[PDB]
Design a protein around this ligand. Structure first.
Ligand SMILES: OC[C@@H]1O[C@@H](OC[C@@H]2NC[C@H](O)[C@H]2O)[C@H](O)[C@H]1O
Ligand SMILES: [Mn+2]
Ligand SMILES: [Mn+2]
Ligand SMILES: [Mn+2]
Ligand SMILES: [Mn+2]
Ligand SMILES: [Mn+2]
Length: 359
């Protein structure tokens, strides 16, 4: 069988710094290998690194094969890792190169620097490729200037790196932006993806999926979004936008995700699309405050979101992966909750079938 529930990937040493682990990310390579990583809050020195685990049995068993280290700044690779496999060449990096992007940050949290590292051997070694975006102090506070949370996706001849940006600090507490590259070395001018006139709004945490009608869905948490629930003055509801050109989300209408029973997912979302489920396939969304998955088999029609229980627990920026050879299979991967985590975070995953979950 290919399904499983709550398989532990990593349990941190107990002296790791709260939250110990956070921010799990998976990747399927073209050969069917899975890689995984997370924020690893080790005692420093040595400077923090992103661990790389590998599974050859679809996620049932794992072992660490390498570490992505900061070779440039003597700071560490600290926050918000993201794994991605090149589907075509970009300059001297061929199809099948594995990228790991993430934020290099000194221990004192005084600066943020989104980096790209690359592996030419399917995750065993790593090379620094380029600096993408420099920002200020790594606290999510209005008026500071950090950058955060890279997400990578190819569009035609460009590679796009989407992220969260506090550098327009007199006009937007945070906004969402991207840069593009054709050689992985030279990055374009910053392009705005989503921003709000209310200074205190904090759209954040962008992920993107391609739909079979040639549109793309862009998903984010809308910090400061309307209608906070009772006893809250500020919340992070999951919103999305749809676009044929994934460089042009800024001008598209926004949509809150609300399931048929009225459930309003909030926090640190993650989107994928699978061909499973008919001609429109199935859009699958997780959020970081509930355990259910949210699905849409109507190309993002705002009236068509459904909610389903799964065995994997609630986690901050819980992530998703669809399997190339069986679109019915869905991996759900997490690394626990925001600090204070009480020593209890672990990295774990489940693999479910949508054909079974969606009843
Ligand atoms: O990943 C570690 C985490 O990052 C910091 O939060 C960043 C904010 N998350 C939502 C917004 O998009 C961004 O400002 C936090 O301090 C750490 O725990
Ligand atoms: Mn243990
Ligand atoms: Mn433990
Ligand atoms: Mn593949
Ligand atoms: Mn439920
Ligand atoms: Mn079964």
């Amino acid at each position: 069988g290919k399904t499983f529930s709550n398989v532990e990937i990593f349990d941190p040493p107990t002296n790791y710094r709260d939250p110990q682990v956070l921010y799990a990310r998976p990747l399927e390579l073209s050969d069917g290998t899975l890689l995984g990583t997370w924020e690893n809050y080790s005692p420093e020195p040595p400077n923090v690194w992103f661990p790389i685990v590998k599974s050859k049995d679809g996620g049932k068993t794992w072992k660490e094969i390498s570490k992505v280290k900061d070779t440039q700044n003597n700071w560490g690779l600290r926050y918000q890792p993201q794994l991605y496999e090149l589907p075509r060449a970009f300059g001297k990096y061929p199809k099948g190169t594995v990228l790991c992007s993430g934020s290099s940050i000194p221990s004192d949290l005084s600066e943020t620097l989104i980096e790209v590292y690359a592996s030419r051997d399917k995750g065993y070694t790593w090379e620094f490729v380029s600096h993408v975006a420099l920002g200020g102090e790594a606290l999510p506070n209005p008026g500071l200037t950090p950058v955060w949370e890279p997400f990578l996706m190819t569009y035609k001849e460009k590679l796009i790196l989407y992220y969260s940006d506090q550098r327009d600090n007199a006009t937007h507490s945070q906004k969402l932006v991207h840069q593009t590259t054709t050689d992985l070395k030279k990055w374009s001018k910053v392009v705005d993806d989503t921003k709000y006139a209310n200074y205190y709004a904090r759209p954040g945490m962008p992920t993107v999926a391609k739909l079979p009608n040639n549109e793309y869905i862009y998903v984010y948490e809308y910090g400061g979004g309307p209608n906070p629930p009772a006893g809250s003055d500020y919340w992070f509801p999951v919103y999305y936008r749809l676009s044929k050109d994934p460089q042009k989300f800024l001008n598209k209408a926004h949509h809150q995700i609300v399931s048929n029973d009225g459930t309003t997912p909030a926090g640190s979302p993650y989107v994928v699309w699978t061909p499973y489920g008919g001609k429109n396939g199935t859009i699958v969304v997780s959020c970081g405050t509930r355990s259910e998955i949210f699905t849409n088999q109507a190309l993002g029609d705002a009236s068509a979101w459904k909610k389903w229980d799964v065995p994997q627990p609630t986690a901050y920026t819980r992530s998703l992966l669809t399997f190339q050879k069986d679109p019915d299979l869905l991996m759900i991967m997490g690394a626990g909750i925001l600090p204070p985590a009480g020593g209890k975070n672990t990295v774990s995953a489940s693999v479910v079938r949508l054909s079974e979950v969606m009843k």
